[PDB]
């Protein structure tokens, strides 16, 4: 519902400055998305795995706030961590059975 976001203070920013800031924002959240797309990072992967391990029990125990199942499997990119944990266990298990 917080669709409209306003900065009340008179920044006195002109039209070109608004365009520059808009471009900066578009780049910022474009990179933010790119931090979660197929272009990941090993450090990001480990951080997301730890976040999943600390968050999936957290929301199922209803620790922080009311949150539905679809949200709490996805709210903080937790499905990435779940997938990478299952990745590691699957690889270390297929290697062992050999």
């Amino acid at each position: 519902d917080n669709v409209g976001s306003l900065e009340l203070n008179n920044l006195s920013t002109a039209e070109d400055v608004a365009t520059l800031q808009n471009q900066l924002n578009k780049l910022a959240e474009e990179k933010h998305k790119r931090s979660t797309w197929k272009g990941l990072t090993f450090r990001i992967a480990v951080q997301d795995m730890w976040e999943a391990l600390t968050g999936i029990p957290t929301d199922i125990y209803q620790n922080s706030g009311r949150v539905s199942l679809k949200e709490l499997l996805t709210r903080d990119d937790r499905l990435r961590g779940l997938g990478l944990i299952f990745f590691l266990v699957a690889v270390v298990s297929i290697f062992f059975l050999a």
Binding site: S5, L6, E7
Partner: protein, 42 residues
Amino acid sequence: YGAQDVYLTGNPQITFFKAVYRRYTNFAMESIQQTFDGTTDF
């Protein structure tokens, strides 16, 4: 960047004759006596 901002709600208003009372912080005032260091005289 976001220095002093609010979320913004569209809501048609009566142009006038509606008192719009804007919400404030939870504060309270008390008169508290302070004491003097040194003689308080002429």
